[PDB]
């Protein structure tokens, strides 16, 4: 079943009722380990259940591999389980091996455990929405507004001459690619507003989770932005070294401008590298032609943001408004949200998102159970990002700014070498990029960095029109273990990506194909991120793997 937007407080009361039936902890929140919207949403929830004494418990969940294991170990005392950031697209009852009668132990149908799903991913799995009482999803209004034809085709659950092509209806429905259509933190903030629990810390966590959607679903962030600015505009209390004040200021779409330099904010932007192609040499000259036309000398633009003259910083606004659109970089001009704690330096929400992403990926900076070394590194990367959400832990936020700058620079140098060597070759249904060693930071033994290099290659490369709609497969050989690390990327929708008249790729469920091929490949290390991505195979297993991939959906 599902709850409408109106029923959010009703479902919240159901959780607050069942979890406060005993001093013992009977509330568990399963957090999607590596996405900021889920990270901040559970922080809002825990703080809600902490500002109000409900014993909660946070469990980072990396993938459906970890979901099945962690659920099978839930002590029976837990009558309320929250899945934040995942689970909506799969049949949770079937996957969790749940018999609804084993849980039947007033009104409706009451179970010993309620499993709520707070997930902004789409499409909804129709069993979670229409064929389950114990699975209780927090809906966006997506079901009431869009799923009419699929609900009818689903409720043709006849079992018993004449024929029924509702199968074709559900086939087209489940052949859509996975997308994100909302912010979980924005939904949590709507619950806090309905129950009157909106402090400035909750709004900041709401802004953080929503801002983290701008990197891959920009038009979702653009849709939720007016209500964010409406809240910030509303709260107008006009001290403490802990006073939290939010303010709407220009927050330009450059890479950590206020924490590096005006030159490096451009040079390391994936947006301006897509519009200028800085990886070659003709492109960098045009960045210098841009600064020259701006009247900003290079030596001043390359000064650190602190040392740079304020005279330029106060003219940066108007300078951007007259020079940028000539180079097709108008999207740099952007208003954002800025948080200040007492009288320390201010931090941006987009800058905050950059630090949380670096902490989540490289926070701590026998291939059997060597995955455990990855598991323990990932959950501690989660708790570092969880601790960074404490306002008093400014040291963690500032190290993430440094990791993000070191991470992006390494990604830039590797991708520039890949683009200038023309390594990405082009097959019918996917693009292939085979890396050898890679002399920069870590051979991509750290698997999350390989995904970021792929997204970098997808973003900053030109590759015409007919072609960036294609997924990208990346293989990185580890000459020490003689193994490949293989990852599959579907192109997403960042801020600077033109969206008009363009069409979704006809084969938008490539991650489904990539998952099916890995499930029949001898993986020496099998990594399960929620959208099916990374495995480690022997060198001689890569050739059959890529060959099978070209046959996806044929027979």
């Amino acid at each position: 079943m599902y709850y409408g937007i109106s029923q959010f407080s009703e479902a919240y009361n159901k959780i607050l009722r069942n979890s406060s039936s005993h001093s013992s902890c009977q509330l568990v929140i399963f957090v999607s380990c590596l996405n900021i919207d889920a990270l901040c949403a559970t922080k809002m929830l825990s703080l809600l259940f902490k500002k109000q004494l409900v014993q909660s418990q946070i469990v980072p969940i990396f993938g459906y591999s970890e979901l099945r294991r962690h659920y099978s170990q839930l002590d029976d005392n837990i009558n309320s389980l929250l899945l934040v950031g995942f689970g909506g697209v799969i049949d949770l009852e079937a996957f969790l091996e749940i018999d609804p009668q084993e849980y039947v132990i007033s009104g409706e149908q009451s179970f010993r455990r309620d499993i709520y799903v707070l997930d902004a991913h789409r499409p909804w799995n129709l069993d979670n929405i229409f064929g389950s009482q114990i699975i209780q999803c927090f809906d966006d209004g997506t079901v009431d507004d869009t799923l009419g034809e699929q609900k009818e085709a689903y409720y043709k659950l006849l079992e018993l001459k004449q024929i029924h092509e509702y199968e074709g209806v559900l086939e087209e429905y489940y052949s859509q690619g996975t997308t994100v259509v909302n912010s979980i933190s924005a939904q949590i903030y709507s619950l806090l507003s309905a129950i009157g629990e909106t402090n400035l810390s909750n709004l900041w966590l709401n802004i953080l989770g929503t801002t983290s959607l701008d990197i891959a679903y920009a038009q979702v962030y653009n849709r939720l932005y007016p209500l964010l600015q409406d809240e910030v505009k509303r709260l107008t209390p006009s001290k403490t070294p802990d006073t939290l004040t939010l303010n709407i200021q220009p927050d330009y779409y450059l890479f950590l401008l206020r924490h590096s330099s005006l030159y490096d904010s451009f040079y390391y932007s994936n947006y301006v590298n897509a519009k200028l192609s800085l990886w070659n040499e003709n492109g960098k000259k045009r960045l210098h032609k841009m600064f020259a036309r701006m009247g900003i000398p290079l030596s001043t633009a390359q000064e650190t943001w602190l040392y740079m003259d304020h005279s330029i910083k106060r003219e940066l606004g108007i300078i951007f408004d007259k020079n940028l659109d000539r180079y097709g970089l108008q999207d740099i001009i952007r208003d954002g949200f800025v948080r200040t704690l007492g009288y320390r330096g201010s931090i941006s929400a987009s800058e905050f998102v950059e630090a949380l992403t670096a902490l989540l990926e490289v926070g701590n900076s026998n291939s059997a159970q060597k995955l455990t070394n990855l598991r323990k590194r990932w959950v501690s990367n989660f708790w570092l990002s969880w601790d960074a959400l404490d306002d008093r832990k400014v040291e963690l936020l500032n190290r993430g700014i440094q990791l993000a700058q070191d991470l992006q620079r390494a990604i830039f140098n590797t991708g520039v070498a890949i683009l200038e060597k023309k390594l990405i070759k082009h097959l019918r249904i996917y693009r292939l990029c085979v890396l050898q060693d890679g002399p920069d930071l870590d051979l991509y033994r750290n698997p999350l960095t390989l995904l970021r290099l792929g997204n970098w290659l997808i973003e900053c490369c030109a590759e015409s029109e007919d072609k960036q709609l294609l997924p990208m497969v990346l293989a990185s050989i580890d000459e020490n273990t003689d193994t490949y690390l293989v990852a599959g990327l579907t192109p997403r929708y960042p801020r600077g990506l033109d969206t008009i008249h363009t069409k979704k790729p006809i084969l938008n469920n490539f991650s489904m194909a990539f998952q099916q091929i890995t499930a029949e490949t001898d993986a020496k290390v099998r990594i399960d991120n929620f959208e099916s991505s990374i495995i480690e195979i022997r060198r001689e297993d890569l050739s059959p793997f890529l060959e099978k991939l070209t046959l996806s959906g044929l027979l």
Binding site: E171, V434, L507, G553
Partner: protein, 241 residues
């Protein structure tokens, strides 16, 4: 010379296993003599129906090609003594009469034969495309294929639920040929063993064994006037955007 069926069987496996002989010989002389032969036995017309019917029997589906080259099974005995003899003789020349073999020799012999038969099957496909007047399909092949692309995406869904096409074959072979080239280059290894020297021609654009050489020495000379759209399509795919 006995039966054109067993003649083209003799000449196909001769073209496959004789690594030194260029594939242009199979196009310029072998396939021409076969087309001249069906001409006599079936008349001046209604012999393409028999000429293609015989080439069709040597055309390998992309699924058949993989089962044929997996686990070095190509070096395992063939049923017909005609084909099996060419297999043994190439073994005598490349794996048995090359002294101080390495374990890489068998692997090198298979990747050479695999990349060679890809081009060989492309030749059969290009010939069938011409006989059936299908070259028009290769103009905006990317734009026409979007309909089958939707079929493939729907088919991926069909497995986790309920709880002939020569131009697509040519596209699949080109995809398989590119994967072979990309991994052979990325393997790295920064006359010779005579089977080795042939493996090095796979990436030498001077040689017919390479994709560039196969284009300039076999495809453009002998197929550009009969199947010009497909030749340009093959070029656009192998050269890359």
């Amino acid at each position: 010379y006995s039966d054109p069926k067993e003649y083209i069987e003799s000449k196909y496996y001769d073209a496959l296993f004789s690594i030194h002989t260029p594939l242009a010989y199979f196009v310029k002389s072998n396939l021409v003599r076969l087309k001249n032969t069906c001409r006599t036995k079936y008349g001046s017309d209604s012999y393409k129906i028999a000429y293609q019917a015989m080439l069709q029997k040597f055309l390998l589906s992309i699924v058949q090609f993989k089962d044929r080259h997996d686990n070095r099974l190509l070096l395992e005995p063939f049923s017909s003594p005609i084909a099996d003899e060419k297999r043994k003789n190439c073994l005598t020349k490349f794996v048995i009469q090359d002294e101080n073999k390495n374990s890489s020799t068998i692997a090198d012999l298979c990747v050479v034969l695999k990349s060679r038969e890809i081009k060989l099957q492309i030749l059969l496909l290009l010939e069938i495309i011409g006989l059936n007047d299908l070259d028009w399909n290769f103009r905006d092949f990317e734009k026409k294929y979007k309909l089958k692309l939707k079929k493939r995406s729907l088919n991926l869904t069909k497995k986790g639920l309920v709880r002939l096409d020569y131009c697509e074959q040519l596209d699949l072979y080109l995809d398989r040929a590119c994967i072979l080239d990309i991994l052979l280059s990325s393997e790295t290894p920064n006359s010779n063993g005579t089977i080795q020297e042939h493996k090095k021609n796979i990436l030498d654009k001077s040689k017919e064994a390479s994709l560039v050489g196969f284009i300039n020495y076999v495809l453009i000379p002998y197929f550009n006037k009969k199947v010009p759209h497909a030749v340009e399509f093959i070029i656009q795919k192998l050269k890359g955007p």
